[PDB]
């Protein structure tokens, strides 16, 4: 009735093999007593890096050890623990005189790869899923607090991006806006994991267009639309000149984090957003350098 190779055909197994399990690691591993071992056949110290596995040699088999009850915690090295710390990710200028952002409004493309500290941290992993708490610290360039009313509006990709301080999009009938005086404590808001993918992707090795991929378009290599969350717009709430030069610092703090596929830490300086370019001529070593391997 069947053909056997069809009854066996393990084609369609949705479950992943595994091989490894997750164990409780509340504290560091304890050290149990060790004694001299003079025997042939058992060689812990001998390993083979070629295999591709880290040496599994225990302190106990390398020296006579005492007993130590390690109660040191590992809580501070969790992801939420490590990543859930507010950091600067965006900065916006609203000067009186200038060419940057006059007219009293600004459209900041929501991209957290513009500030080296925060960027390097996350670029530790390839994928990352999480909610976040955005805080907005506004004031004048002197750090002086001023009685001015702003309006921050999150504009999802597709929504009409404001063209002027008095644009119609500021009616914000469905977009979520926040009205704040620069004298009120920094506005703070909770943001869900909004993406069509299951995790944000710091690195996307490929294109999104699907076309020819000529020279003029290599601009898109590495551009993954599942991270383009839209823009953040801000404007002094009025009809006339703001009267004061403003600056908004955007701080993001992740929470409910899930990270996957750890990769090498950024070695060189950063040059552009969403683009791992590096200075070809100024390729500095990862660390410090000595004069000889035989001296400190």
């Amino acid at each position: 009735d069947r053909v056997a190779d069809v009854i066996e055909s393990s084609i369609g197994d949705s479950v992943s093999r595994a091989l490894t399990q997750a164990l409780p690691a509340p504290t560091g591993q304890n050290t149990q007593v060790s004694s001299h071992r003079l025997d042939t056949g058992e060689v812990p110290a001998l390993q083979a890096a070629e295999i591709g596995a880290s040496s599994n040699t225990s302190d106990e088999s390398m020296i006579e050890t005492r007993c130590v009850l390690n109660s040191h915690s590992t809580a501070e090295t969790t992801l939420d623990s490590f990543f859930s710390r507010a950091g600067l990710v965006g900065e916006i200028d609203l000067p009186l005189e200038g060419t940057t952002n006059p007219n009293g409004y600004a459209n900041w493309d929501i991209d957290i790869t513009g500030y080296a500290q925060m960027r390097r941290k996350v670029e530790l992993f390839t994928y990352m899923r999480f909610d976040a708490e955005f805080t907005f610290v506004a004031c004048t360039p002197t750090g002086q607090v001023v009685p001015q009313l702003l309006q921050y509006m999150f504009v999802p990709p597709g929504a009409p991006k404001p063209e002027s301080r008095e644009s119609l999009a500021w009616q914000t009938a469905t977009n979520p806006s926040v009205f704040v005086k620069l004298t009120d404590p920094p506005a703070q808001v909770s943001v869900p994991f909004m993406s069509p993918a299951s995790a944000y992707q710091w690195f996307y090795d490929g294109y999104p267009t699907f076309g020819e991929h000529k020279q003029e378009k290599d601009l898109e290599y590495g551009a993954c639309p599942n991270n383009m969350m839209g823009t953040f717009s801000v404007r002094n709430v009025g009809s006339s000149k703001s009267k004061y030069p403003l600056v908004v610092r955007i701080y993001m703090r992740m929470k409910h984090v899930r990270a996957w596929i750890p990769r090498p830490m950024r070695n060189q300086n950063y040059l552009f957003k969403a683009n791992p370019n590096y200075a070809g001529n100024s390729i500095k070593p990862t660390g410090t350098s000595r004069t000889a391997i035989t001296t400190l």
Binding site: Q215, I261, I283
Partner: protein
């Protein structure tokens, strides 16, 4: 019973008498897409044996001065074989891989290659040297297919990241005094159940000489390195006409 091994998939069988065990990427065997993980509502194609097999794609020559090479993956196998076809006709693709890099020499030769799997391996430019120019790596460099590409600044994996740390990735070494081949088994890894085999490359295969090849003169100097990969649990959906890119 650990240095010798045989890998058999489809109608292909690889033999090795000096291998150093098998690495299973992130400790997970390649699986098919779950019913609750998928979204594409059309019933996919699972060619099985016609595409899940060992394609021996390329050979490089290791020289006392070689810098290293890489191959972007989803792609490398396109245009070649029935796999290639299903990857061009279908929009959506999904699959794990069994990568077997081989390279032998004599007991009188010496050297050591690092063989890693770097997921989402985005390439970067030298930025015009000074760093003022916002250049971008060309299609010929980001998606070299077979033949791979040679690294220009291996120390930073042409992407500003230390190769010294590349081992946090499924890797294996080919130390000539110890073995003559590496074997990594990577599962499908992406933030999506399926994606276009064409314009997205799930990971790159790195093969870099960390300890330079060397041998007294007179010993055969042609030391090749051959890549042989095999898709596993290949699934395709979203059938249309055939597409090259």
């Amino acid at each position: 019973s650990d240095r010798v091994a045989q890998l058999t998939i489809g109608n292909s069988t690889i033999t090795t008498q000096e291998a150093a065990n098998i690495i299973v990427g992130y400790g997970e065997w390649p699986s098919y897409c779950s019913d609750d993980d998928a979204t594409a509502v059309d019933k996919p194609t699972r060619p099985d044996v016609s595409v899940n097999r060992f394609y021996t794609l390329d050979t490089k020559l290791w020289e006392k001065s070689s810098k290293g090479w890489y191959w972007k993956f989803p792609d490398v196998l396109t245009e070649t074989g029935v796999f290639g076809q299903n990857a061009q006709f279908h929009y959506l693709y999904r699959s794990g891989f069994c990568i077997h890099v081989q390279c032998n020499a004599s007991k009188f030769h010496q050297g050591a290659l690092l063989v890693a799997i770097l997921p989402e391996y985005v390439i970067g430019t030298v930025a015009g040297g000074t760093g003022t120019e916002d250049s971008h790596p060309p299609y010929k460099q980001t998606q070299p297919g077979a033949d791979g590409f040679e690294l220009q600044h291996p120390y930073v994996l042409d992407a500003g990241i230390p190769i010294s740390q590349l081992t946090v990735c499924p890797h294996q070494w080919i130390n000539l005094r110890t073995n003559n081949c590496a074997t990594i088994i990577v599962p499908y890894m992406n933030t999506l159940p399926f994606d276009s085999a064409l314009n997205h490359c799930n990971f790159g295969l790195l093969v870099v000489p960390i300890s330079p090849l060397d041998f007294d003169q007179g010993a055969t100097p042609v030391i090749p390195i051959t890549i042989t990969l095999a898709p596993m649990c290949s699934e395709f959906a979203g059938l249309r006409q055939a597409v090259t890119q």
